[PDB]
Design a protein around this ligand. Sequence first.
Ligand SMILES: CNS(=O)(=O)Cc1cc(C)on1
Length: 185
Amino acid sequence: HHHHHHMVHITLDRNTANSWLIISKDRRQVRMGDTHQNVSDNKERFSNYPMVLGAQRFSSGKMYWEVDVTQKEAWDLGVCRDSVQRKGQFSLSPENGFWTIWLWQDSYEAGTSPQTTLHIQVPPCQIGIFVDYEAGVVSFYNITDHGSLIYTFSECVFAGPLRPFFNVGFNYSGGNAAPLKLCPL
Ligand SMILES: CNS(=O)(=O)Cc1cc(C)on1
């Protein structure tokens, strides 16, 4: 792919984070804490899952960024509508305002309804995310495997401003403590 020149500098919005998340001082890394991180509750925080949004809002143009997922067992990545539900249980689907992929139990799936099996020969250490607002496209690339296509959502109905979306996943196993990191341009 030739999307690298649409690179945007993404930072994490602390106020949207689940109360157990630790966001680095530079707002470029997030990991699951082993306890509540002593922050006040607010209506923006994801209550049920270890999720957080990027600060940046997109309503036009072409945007590209990369995320490090090294040594993680579980995560969700992509983009969501600014107005997605924060409280209670929900599924990651376009109907709910999410355009995402994930790793769970040694398989990669796209967050369609129902979910779609991905075909990945080389487990990714970094994921590229491309959004074309006007075209209605969200694409995912395997940086570890020469930027090979993972998945394309086409005919997307964003229906609002988009925010980068992140889930560091739970760490019941003690093998999923590693952070998500926004990789440098
Ligand atoms: C790639 N197919 S899609 O993203 O699910 C299309 C869609 C459905 C709704 C709702 O908003 N966009």
